[PDB]
Amino acid sequence: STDNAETGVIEANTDTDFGELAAPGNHTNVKFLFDRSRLLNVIKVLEKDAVFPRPFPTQEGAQQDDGYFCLLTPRPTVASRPATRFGLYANPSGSGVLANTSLDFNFYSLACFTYFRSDLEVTVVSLEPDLEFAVGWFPSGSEYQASSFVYDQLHVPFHFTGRTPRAFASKGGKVSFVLPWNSVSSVLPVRWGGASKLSSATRGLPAHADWGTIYAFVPRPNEKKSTAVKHVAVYIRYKNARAWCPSMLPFRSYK
Amino acid sequence: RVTTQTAGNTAINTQSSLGVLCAYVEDPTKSDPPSSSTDQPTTTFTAIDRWYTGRLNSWTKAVKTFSFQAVPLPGAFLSRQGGLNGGAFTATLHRHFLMKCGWQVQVQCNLTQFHQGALLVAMVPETTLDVKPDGKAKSLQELNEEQWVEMSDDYRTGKNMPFQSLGTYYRPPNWTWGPNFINPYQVTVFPHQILNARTSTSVDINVPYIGETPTQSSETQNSWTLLVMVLVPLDYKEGATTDPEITFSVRPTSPYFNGLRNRYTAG
Amino acid sequence: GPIPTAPRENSLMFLSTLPDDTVPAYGNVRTPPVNYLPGEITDLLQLARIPTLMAFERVPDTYVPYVAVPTQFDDRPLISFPITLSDPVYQNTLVGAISSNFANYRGCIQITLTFCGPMMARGKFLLSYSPPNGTQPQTLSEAMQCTYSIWDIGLNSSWTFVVPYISPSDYRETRAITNSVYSADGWFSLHKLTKITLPPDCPQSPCILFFASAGEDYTLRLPVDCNPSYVF
């Protein structure tokens, strides 16, 4: 029919040309679609007080504990820090240390807007049989407390106690709870183009776009360290999500 | 199809026009002062309530499909790109810390009926194309040699945006993706108009203010970016006409300013 | 006193899509208002209703989104493609991208065209839509009998062709594997009825742009998992 699509705003079934007005029969709603769990990352389990990674760039011969901790955000991250370029180690054995990375494939498969906001609901699942553990979390912009104290000649890491929530699960159990949107920024920028500092900043790297941080540890004294490593899984959900402006979608190769 | 819009002491004429695209909401002009500060703000006045004009590179047959050029806002004012000179607006910008404003632009071309081709212009929000992959803004001298940006798999995948080097402690990963890819086939989602060679000459858009905070820093914000891309390569009979030119006009709307101080300096 | 109870067979189970809440841990937190942000989204159909561009293989990357009219033809449509949403031509369109993440769809697809060439040219085109058959129709004589329409170059260079929805079932699958009647729904083709008259001094070979989107009665039902292939 007559129209002018160069103007952009085109008009708007078969009743117009030849109709059929098939009756309705809301599964695409933003609030409904995003309410379901999905894996985020897999992390080790602590057995003593750890040293948080230093900010980049990290020089050779720097002592720290890497592989633990994990942010709560869909945007790409590296070494438990915000990042922009997603990457992976597809190459064979090399040298140095390998940096853990994460990303929300399912979220970005339909991330067709710019700004987002919702509540987060976290849960944790163990992997090794009959494993006992616990979880700890702190808000954005805070810091992880190091060092340990002595009780009856046993070194208890400080992270056993704090004003932030703690969770103890029975042998072979699971954890779950819901946290509030606590970042300073009003909404989460899916893609950004600003700078966080007046000088020496990196374009397009947001500062406090997340929900917090999480870690896992065993309720034992530091005098009972073991050798075999342990692992833990993490899942997240979104509650009352909202979107605020259109955007693009990931490109699909034509190979 | 003949209308003129008057603002301040300057006016613009349109021999052909379809209308004005109002973007997300009706009446983008309406706005309110921010809420993340207390000091009284500075508002609009006649000195800044007017248009501004600039120039772009020429269009040549050698250009292929999907090539593009970008003009960040308001960073164009600060960089003096394309000869644009904000004057009073730039002077006021350099003497403040917080800003909030809309935008309203129009682009014109001099295509004649004896030419075939198409152009697409849109206001892509929250993008970074000006910066080189190294992590430094493209200089005015560098922007001249290359008149149009060549589309490539790297840009399509967003694999070459600025990043932070890890350091000798780690091993270099293989970068393969980033959240600022460019998808040419879907650029029409943002407000746009098709500048065909046989239907019209001038296009225009009206956009409101957006951002993840009620106000953004006035020295680094890059909310809106003006993008022009070529769909159908230019072609014409030899000897008729050569390489038309391009121009554009800008005008802020209902701005606010906060945080007075001396002139900005770096180091 | 204690209330008698009997735990069921599915206690201590974890469901990834259970419609229920969880206990709060750090409640009683306020947040800044967001009434200043315009353009809130409510349903992805709003984005699905926006036109976008298609792709084509081009002669022997080469995936230009337009088709160029040749000079001499041979009893064959200029371009034709199936109506299966898993087809390559629908890959990057918003409708195809969104639908690929759902199982069932329902409604009328919408196709829009636009001409790009010299003003003083003329011509006439024919658009066709053939439901499923044993063999894809080729000749103009065959095409004419099925549903069709005639497009005439004039002041307005754009035209919209609405594909009717006919199928033996209320819903239809979104991706085709066996090409059963439940997924495939025929073909679409473009035929040059006349010969395009290029005015003097206008060089040659105009081009046509394809615009596709969803109709006003589109719908999707069942969510599914995604393909992370785009990360590699």
Add this chain to the structure above:
Amino acid sequence: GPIPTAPRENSLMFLSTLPDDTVPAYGNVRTPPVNYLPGEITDLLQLARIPTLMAFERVPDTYVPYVAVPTQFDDRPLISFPITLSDPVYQNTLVGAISSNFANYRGCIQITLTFCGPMMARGKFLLSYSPPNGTQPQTLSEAMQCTYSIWDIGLNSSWTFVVPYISPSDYRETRAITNSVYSADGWFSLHKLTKITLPPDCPQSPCILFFASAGEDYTLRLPVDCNPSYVF
């Protein structure tokens, strides 16, 4: 009969901040009344609103809480400090100590001064507040353009300077690590506009005392863990 039930996935869990009570073990106990004790506290902001003293490095412990005016000057403020609550100067003030245990703050800081010297002296001072910039302003000419005020020695020897709250976000972080725009908020400085006239027989070199506190619209949001460093 028994009521069917289904325990959830998070049974037998212990939360250190769960908002719920526990079963009593030794209830039904009375206690003596406490209506005789005056001065009950309800909110720590009441204590946060009380002025206190600051610290300064002094010339080469040496952390006297006052600043002494020199005789000859050189185009530079007598004392300046950032507006980051993690700065050393804010360590022992009540506002700094309390805020260090919370994540986000909001409101206007308050600064108060007082003069200590001979009665029959005279002078004039200038106070400045510079939002974030590429370089900290130094000269009086620069300082004058920004927000400022002039203090005159007279019958009243005390003055209060209110630091306005301007930021791109509703809330701000309490401790700075990267010095991002979300934590740092500029600098404060003191400049001697004139030369202080010491009356005869009054020896020299008066002193100034710094008083800091919280404004009337201060606020803190998120509790956090503490630092036990004070025990060592």
Add this chain to the structure above:
Amino acid sequence: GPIPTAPRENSLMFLSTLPDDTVPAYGNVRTPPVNYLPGEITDLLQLARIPTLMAFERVP
């Protein structure tokens, strides 16, 4: 506060004919109507009331 309770002797049991429902996992799904199909059955006695044939050994 917590409500006291006492699980019975037959907890965590599975019955193949227990008259009770189960928690939904993928609810909120609509289906096409079936008002166009005639001849709905309600009780198998309707089919039981229909004559049929018998069998007999016949001579060897």
Add this chain to the structure above:
Amino acid sequence: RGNNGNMTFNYYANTYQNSVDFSTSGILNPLGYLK
């Protein structure tokens, strides 16, 4: 109706418990009529 005993309380909503068809807007009948 059906092998369902509970007759006091349904926790989850009907739409989330059972499917519903979308609108398009003793005594036993015999399966054979002989005019």
Add this chain to the structure above:
Amino acid sequence: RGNNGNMTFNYYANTYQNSVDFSTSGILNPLGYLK
């Protein structure tokens, strides 16, 4: 609203269940208006 089935009883208070913004005191609109 949302993928929530329970419609009979909410135990914890709304303020402790969901965040709330502090006061400062079918039919689908199109995202583009063309005057």
Add this chain to the structure above:
Amino acid sequence: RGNNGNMTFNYYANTYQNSVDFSTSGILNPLGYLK
């Protein structure tokens, strides 16, 4: 009042839940008055 979420039902009696003193029969006041 306090970090308590439940607002529907208290099982045990108040006397057995919290201590009680036996009878002997926004707006914030300032802790200092200057006559």
